[PDB]
């Protein structure tokens, strides 16, 4: 479609809950070790689901996938790993959305990138939220969804938690 800027991509954001407080409690040396380990785990899981880490945001990542099932499986695997590690507790919120986005270098721009970020911002620590398009596109179980408004967007959006 000529009027369409940008190509379809699934965008996933992760974000550690209360990372600043954690950093203050454990100190910078321990924080650097922690985020280094976390980066490696996330990187490895993304690679397993054929995604690409676009960038780090300090205590989380922006990630691109071709298919929604890849992004959701990556999220499920990360949450499972964070739970496993805590029984030796970093909590992460994950949001997933899909739509056209504009590529510039390795980065992605446009309203669907913003949407993915707000879906993630809506998620509780330990939760994976996905937008309706992702839910509709998808051995994965979802809740019945919840209506929310997102910062910068008009109207309401139904977001679905992975169960």
Ligand X SMILES: C[C@H]1O[C@@H](n2cnc3c(N)ncnc32)C[C@@H]1OP(=O)(O)OP(=O)(O)OP(=O)(O)O
Residues that bind Cl ion (CB under 5 A): 84, 87, 118, 121, 150-151
For 4-8, the CB contacts below 8 A with 24+ separation are 4/100, 5/100, 5/102, 5/110, 6/100, 6/101, 6/102, 6/103, 6/109, 6/110, 6/112, 7/100, 7/101, 7/103, 8/98, 8/99, 8/100
Angle, helices 28-48/19-26, rounded to nearest 10 degrees? 130
Of 33, 109, 124, 146, the residue at the interface with ligand X (CB under 6 A) is 109
Strand blocks (E) in the chain: 7-16, 52-56, 61-65, 92-104, 107-109, 128-131, 146-148, 157-161
122 is in an annotated binding site: yes
Residue nearest to ligand X (CB): 58
CB count within 10 Å of CB 40 equals 10
Size of the site for ligand X (CB under 6 A): 19
108 is in an annotated binding site: no
160 is in an annotated binding site: no
For residue 15, the minimal CB distance to Mn ion (Å) is: 4
Stretch that binds Mn ion, among 9-17, 34-42, 129-137, 138-146 (CB under 5 A): 9-17
CA distance 93 to 108: 21
Of 9, 11, 12, 16, the residue at the interface with Mn ion (CB under 5 A) is 16
Tokens of 96: 């997933």
Size of the site for Mn ion (CB under 5 A): 4
107 is in an annotated binding site: no
- Window 54 to 93, contacts with ligand X (CB under 6 A): 57-59, 62
31 binds its own copies, rule: CB under 8 A: yes
Annotated binding site, which residues?
15-16, 59, 118, 122, 150, 153
Residues of this chain that interact with ligand X (CB under 6 A) are 15-20, 57-59, 62, 107-109, 113-114, 117-118, 151-152
Annotated binding site for Mn(2+), which residues?
15-16, 59
């Amino acid at each position: 479609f000529q009027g369409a800027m940008g190509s379809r991509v699934v965008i996933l954001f992760t974000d550690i809950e209360e990372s600043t407080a954690l950093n203050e409690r454990i100190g910078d040396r321990a924080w650097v070790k922690l985020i280094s380990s976390h980066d490696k785990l996330v990187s490895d899981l993304v690679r397993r689901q054929s995604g690409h880490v676009v960038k780090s945001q300090g205590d989380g990542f922006m990630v691109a996938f071709a298919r929604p099932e890849q992004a959701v499986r990556c999220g499920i695997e990360l949450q499972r790993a964070l739970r496993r590690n805590a029984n030796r507790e970093i909590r992460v919120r994950i949001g997933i959305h899909m739509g056209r986005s504009v590529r510039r270098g390795d980065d992605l721009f446009g309203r669907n990138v913003a949407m993915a970020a707000r879906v993630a911002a809506q998620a509780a620590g330990g939760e994976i939220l996905v937008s309706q398009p992702v839910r509709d596109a998808l051995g994965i179980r979802f809740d019945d969804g919840r209506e929310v408004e997102l910062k910068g967007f008009s109207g309401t959006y139904r977001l679905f938690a992975v169960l």
